[PDB]
Design a protein around this nucleic acid. Structure first.
Length: 92
DNA sequence: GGCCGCTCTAGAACAGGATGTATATATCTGACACGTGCCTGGAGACTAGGGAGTAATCCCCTTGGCGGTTAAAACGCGGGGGACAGC
């Protein structure tokens, strides 16, 4: 199962990173406290990085548009700007 | 020095998650039927001896009749006891 990701896990990850930024430090605790259902740590890591890159791409698409929700694996429960800002702000 | 734009706050709408309940769908459970394979019993064939069947004769038993006598059965009558209904 560890290579799959469920929409409930997409939700839980999205909320987690909305609260905590680069979860991959904490992420073991976030599984151990049950915030995230059990999955491969590597899979959560890569799908996090993937959506960070997709958020950057969304910002490039905004730049293309002028010169906000976007899906993960079709799951619409995601937006770029909140995550990107929250992650960098909480890191700082 | 003035006005408009930008930012923040407030209200409204929509969606998702959480929880409980109902309904539909799937799975199990069981028995019957059919198919397959193997083994055993039945079927077929042949012979010899014994049992059954057939025939005759004789003897004993059973059936039928007669007569008389005796006991049993049938008819009769009255009274008592038991059975039946009630409470």
């Amino acid at each position: 199962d560890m290579d799959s990701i469920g929409e409930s896990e997409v939700r839980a990850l999205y909320k987690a990173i909305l609260k905590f930024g680069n979860l991959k430090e904490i992420l073991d605790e976030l599984i151990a406290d049950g915030t995230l259902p059990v999955k491969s740590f590597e899979k959560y890591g890569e799908t996090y990085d993937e959506m960070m890159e997709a958020a950057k791409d969304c910002v490039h698409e905004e730049e293309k548009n002028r010169k906000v929700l976007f899906n993960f694996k079709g799951v619409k429960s995601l937006n770029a700007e909140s995550l990107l800002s929250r992650v960098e702000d909480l890191k700082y």
